[PDB]
Design a protein around this ligand. Structure first.
Ligand SMILES: *[C@H]1C[C@](C)(N)C(O)(O)[C@H](C)O1
Ligand SMILES: *[C@H]1C[C@](C)(N)C(O)(O)[C@H](C)O1
Lengths: 4, 7, 7, 5
C-alpha cells in the first residue's frame, strides 16, 4: 500491497 | 498521491 | 533494501 | 531504477  | 510507500 | 521510498 | 529501494 500500500501507498501511492 | 505522489509519495511512494510501502506502508 | 526492501522498503520503498521515494526520498 | 535506483532515492529508495
Ligand atoms: C512494500 C515493502 C514493505 C515495506 N517491505 C512491505 O512488504 O512490508 C509492504 C507491504 O510493501
Ligand atoms: C519519488 C517520488 C517523489 C517523493 N515525489 C520524489 O519525486 O520527490 C522522489 C525523488 O521520488
Amino acid at each position: 500491497x500500500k501507498x501511492x | 498521491x505522489x509519495n511512494x510507500x510501502y506502508x
